[PDB]
C-alpha cells in the first residue's frame, strides 16, 4: 500500500505570508499526489491533483510541487479563512492512501479575554444542581489555563471545558469552563471565581461573584 | 450543480444494522462512480471502496471487505453504505464522494457527511437553562449573555439566538460528553442600549427527542 506522510501536523503563517506543507510517499509515485483541504467541519474540496494542476475553481494561491517521494503544497497570501486540515493523497495504484492532514494556524497577534462568569439559573438549582459557567471571549494565543476557587480554595475537578476551534473571520480562540456543583455544596458557599492566565498578562485575569443587585 | 446530500446522523447500539443514503445530482449517475471514506476523529480521512454506478461492481478496502456493503438505487441515483453488526469502531462519519476518474483516484463533489454513533446509551432529552449576568459589564458598553443547553444525547442540537437573527457574535462551543450525556453552550455579546430592552432568546431545538425550546435570557439581577 503506499504510504503517504506528513509531517509536521500543525502548522502557523501569518495573514498575507506564506506556508509550505509537506507531503512524502513511500515510493515513486510519480507526480500522482492529490492535495484536498477539508474547511473546518466541512467535506473536503479537491484543491489540485497531479501535483500541480489546480482544479475547477481553487485560486492560483495554492501552488503545488514535487517528484519521486517529496511533494509540497505551497499557500500565498494566507486568508484568514484557509484555516483549515489539508490532506495528501496518492493517485498512483491502488488503495488511495492519504497522509494524516496538517492543521494550518493563522497567526494574529495577540487579544486578551473577555472572561465572564454567571451563577446558576435559579431553574437549575430548583432541579438541585449548581452549574457556575465562566467564558473567555476572543483571546489569541491558545494558552490559556482557567483554575476554579470557591471559597479561596482550588477547585480542581467537576469542571468541563470546551474550546471553540480558532476563528476564521478574526483568528482568535474562545472557551467555556463549567463548574458543576450539588444545590447544596453551591448554597454551602459564597466566592465564586474563575482565573485565567494568559500570556496577555502576568497578573491573573481574575472575575469571581456572589449575588448582588445592580 | 453537482450536489450528494446525504441521510442525517445516526444512533444504533452495537451489532446492529445501517444503511446510510446518498443522492447524486447534476450529474449523470451511470457515467461518474460512488467513492466512500471513513474521516474517524482521531486518525484521518481513509478510502472504503468504490462502486461502479454503470455495472454495480463494488471494491472494498481490506479494512472494509466484509461488514461493509455497497448497493445503489441507479434509478433515484442513490448509492448507500450498509455496515452490518456495528462493532464499535464504526463511531465516525461516513463521506460518500464522486469518483472523478474509473476506480475513483480523484474524489472531486464530496458529500456532507453522515455520523455514525454506535451507542448502548440512551436519548435523553435537554436543559436549556438561559443565564444572565451578575451585571458584570462585559467590555465598555457591552453585555455577554449564555446559554447552557445540558444534559442530553446523542449529538447534535441546534441553538439560535434569536430565530438566526443574533448571528455576529454568538460562540456556540463544541459539546463534550461526560460518560453518558453531553453539555453544551453559547454566548452572545450585546451593546447595553439592546438588552434588557430587546427580547434575547435562546431557541434551541434536540431533533432525536422531538425537542424545541425557547428560554427567553429575562434579565435577573
Known amino acids: 500500500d503506499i504510504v503517504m506522510t506528513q509531517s509536521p501536523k500543525f502548522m502557523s503563517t501569518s495573514v498575507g505570508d506564506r506556508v509550505t506543507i509537506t507531503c512524502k510517499a513511500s515510493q515513486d509515485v510519480s507526480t500522482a499526489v492529490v492535495w484536498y483541504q477539508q474547511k473546518p467541519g466541512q467535506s473536503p474540496k479537491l484543491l489540485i491533483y497531479?501535483?500541480?494542476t489546480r482544479h475547477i475553481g481553487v485560486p492560483d494561491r495554492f501552488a503545488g510541487s514535487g517528484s519521486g517521494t517529496d511533494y509540497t503544497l505551497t499557500i500565498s497570501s494566507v486568508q484568514a479563512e484557509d484555516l483549515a486540515l489539508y490532506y495528501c493523497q496518492q493517485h498512483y495504484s491502488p488503495p488511495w492512501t492519504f497522509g494524516g492532514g496538517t492543521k494550518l494556524e493563522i497567526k494574529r497577534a495577540d487579544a486578551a479575554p473577555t472572561v465572564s462568569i454567571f451563577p446558576p439559573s435559579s431553574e437549575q438549582l430548583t432541579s438541585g444542581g449548581a452549574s457556575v459557567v465562566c467564558f473567555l471571549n476572543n483571546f489569541y494565543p491558545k494558552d490559556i489555563n482557567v483554575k476554579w476557587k470557591i471559597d479561596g480554595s482550588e477547585r480542581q475537578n467537576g469542571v468541563l471545558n470546551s474550546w471553540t476551534d480558532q476563528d476564521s473571520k478574526d483568528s482568535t480562540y474562545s472557551m467555556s469552563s463549567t463548574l458543576t456543583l450539588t444545590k447544596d455544596e453551591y448554597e454551602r458557599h459564597n466566592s465564586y471565581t474563575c482565573e485565567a492566565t494568559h500570556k496577555t498578562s502576568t497578573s491573573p485575569i481574575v472575575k469571581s461573584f456572589n449575588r448582588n443587585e445592580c | 450543480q453537482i450536489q450528494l446530500v446525504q441521510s442525517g446522523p445516526e444512533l444504533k447500539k452495537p451489532g446492529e444494522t445501517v444503511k446510510i443514503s446518498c443522492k447524486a445530482s447534476?450529474?449523470?449517475?451511470?457515467?461518474?462512480?460512488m467513492n466512500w471514506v471513513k474521516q474517524a476523529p482521531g486518525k484521518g480521512l481513509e478510502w472504503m471502496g468504490w462502486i461502479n454506478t454503470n455495472t454495480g461492481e463494488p471494491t472494498y478496502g481490506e479494512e472494509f471487505k466484509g461488514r461493509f456493503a455497497f448497493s445503489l438505487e441507479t434509478s433515484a441515483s442513490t448509492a448507500n453504505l450498509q455496515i452490518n453488526n456495528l462493532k464499535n469502531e464504526d463511531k465516525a462519519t461516513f463521506f460518500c464522494?464522486?469518483?472523478?476518474?474509473?476506480?475513483?483516484?480523484?474524489?472531486?463533489?464530496w458529500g456532507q457527511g453522515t455520523t455514525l454513533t454506535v451507542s448502548s446509551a440512551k436519548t435523553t432529552a435537554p436543559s436549556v437553562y438561559p443565564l444572565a449576568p451578575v451585571c458584570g459589564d462585559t467590555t465598555g458598553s457591552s453585555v455577554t449573555l449564555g446559554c447552557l443547553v445540558k444534559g442530553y444525547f446523542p449529538e447534535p442540537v441546534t441553538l439560535t439566538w434569536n430565530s438566526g437573527s443574533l448571528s455576529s457574535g454568538v460562540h456556540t462551543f463544541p459539546a463534550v460528553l461526560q460518560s453518558d450525556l453531553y453539555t453544551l453552550s453559547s454566548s452572545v455579546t450585546v451593546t447595553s442600549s439592546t438588552w434588557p430592552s430587546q427580547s434575547i432568546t435562546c431557541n434551541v431545538a434536540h431533533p432525536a427527542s422531538s425537542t424545541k425550546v425557547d428560554k427567553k435570557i429575562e434579565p435577573r439581577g
Open positions: 464522494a464522486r469518483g472523478e476518474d474509473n476506480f475513483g483516484s480523484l474524489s472531486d463533489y
Open positions: 447534476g450529474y449523470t449517475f451511470t457515467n461518474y462512480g
Open positions: 497531479w501535483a500541480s
